[PDB]
């Protein structure tokens, strides 16, 4: 217990740093506890805005708090304090990217947790930027693989291949391919870059319309019996089978 009167701002990550209310040399000193560990440090500020530590594994810990209290950057290092093992960057809005590292410092794993709670798990990340990917959603899981170019998550029902492609940077594009030649059931879609909507057109009749929200969900507002107007209203998809039925 450093102090209880001259001290405890409990944010942005699930952590509380104890700013002082000066130290021996003009810099407010601040302390935080992270998983049974005491991280001590100093700062020219008096609002929480770096912390060192040493694990019983001889390792090194360096928690960083931004100068506006909007991020934590909890870094765990090897015994030299330069080669890192695990760097988790949590943000204020509960969005975070956690990473693990190999002996040569390359990224082994990477888990991007969005604000809305949806995850994006990367495993077996090769030295080239590739590996096995998966996306944990609200009510279902998507699966795919990774190349450094794009993150590719694919859903197939029979001949149809629904590919959801993610830019390196966050942008989302969707593709659809069908191997049927029957123009009576050749499921063909046309992406919309603006409204972020995929629009199936089966047998020259638009049969449904699939939006991808900025909140990472999938909607279904089917068209009329002639493919001329939207009938009913959009329903959020909660199970994966309901997506295969969208291609069915």
């Amino acid at each position, epitope marked *: 217990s450093l102090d209880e009167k001259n001290s405890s701002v409990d944010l942005p990550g699930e952590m509380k740093v104890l700013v002082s209310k000066k130290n021996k040399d003009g810099k407010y000193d601040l302390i935080a506890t992270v998983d049974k560990l005491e991280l001590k440090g100093t700062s020219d500020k008096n609002n929480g805005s770096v912390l060192e530590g040493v694990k019983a594994d001889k390792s090194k810990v360096k928690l960083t708090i*931004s100068d506006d209290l909007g991020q934590t950057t909890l870094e765990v290092f090897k015994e030299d304090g*330069k*080669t890192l093992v695990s760097k988790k960057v949590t943000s204020k809005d509960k969005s975070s990217t956690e990473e693990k590292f190999n*002996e*040569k*410092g390359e990224v082994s794993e990477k888990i991007i947790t969005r604000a809305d709670g949806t995850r994006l798990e990367y495993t077996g990340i090769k030295s080239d930027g590739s590996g096995k990917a998966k996306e944990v959603l609200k009510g279902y899981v998507l699966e795919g693989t990774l190349t450094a170019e794009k993150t590719t998550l694919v859903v197939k029902e029979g001949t149809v291949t629904l590919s959801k492609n993610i830019s390196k940077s966050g942008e989302v594009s969707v593709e659809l391919n069908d191997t049927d030649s029957s123009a009576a059931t050749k499921k063909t879609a046309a992406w919309n870059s603006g409204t972020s909507t995929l629009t199936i057109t089966v047998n020259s009749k638009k049969t449904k319309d699939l939006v991808f929200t900025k909140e990472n969900t999938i909607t279904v507002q089917q068209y009329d019996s002639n493919g001329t107007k939207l009938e009913g209203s959009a329903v959020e998809i909660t199970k994966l089978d309901e997506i295969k039925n969208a291609l069915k």
Partner: antibody
Amino acid sequence: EVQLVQSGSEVKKPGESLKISCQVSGYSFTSYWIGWVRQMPGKGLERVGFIYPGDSDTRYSPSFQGQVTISADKSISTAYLQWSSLKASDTAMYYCARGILRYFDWFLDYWGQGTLVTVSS
Amino acid sequence: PSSLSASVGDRVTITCRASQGISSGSAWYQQKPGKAPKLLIYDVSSLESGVPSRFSGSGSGTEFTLTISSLQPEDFATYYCQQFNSYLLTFGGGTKVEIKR
């Protein structure tokens, strides 16, 4: 104490092949990366390439891939940078350093003192 | 590159502006004439071991900052800035700090 001792200065003619050494000592040669930097006279630095001696994982700057060749030797803790046929433009000082790999690039922890490479007809 | 004229005791902040900014962090080096550069800052606040506390590094996004609280004589050298952007490769063009008289 960690020391990186590069080979001596070299004077060569367009076409000749050159090897340059860098003998590290003071840390586990294999547990980190080793790399080279090109500093042309009165100019800034240029990352050329890095290797990882633990598995001889070599990675080249795109400005050099095909032009230069990097290797190492665990038994002597030496790193190497070499050319097949030197060009006049190669005339620079080349530094050898220890990289740490921040996602795309290495920041350079320790440096060697050499090495001057004059190349002229 | 660029140059700078300052006297002893002055406070200097070198700014490092990235063209296309996704950087993840930065690093700084000090090169005196005819000598191997020295690592000052990594992971924008480091310090490298053996650097006086008068050296501090901060920044965010595309813009990174190296600062010396008060200049000393040994601090007169060229200073480079390394961003970890996908952009590559050479370095910051360099910034040399000359003595004012």
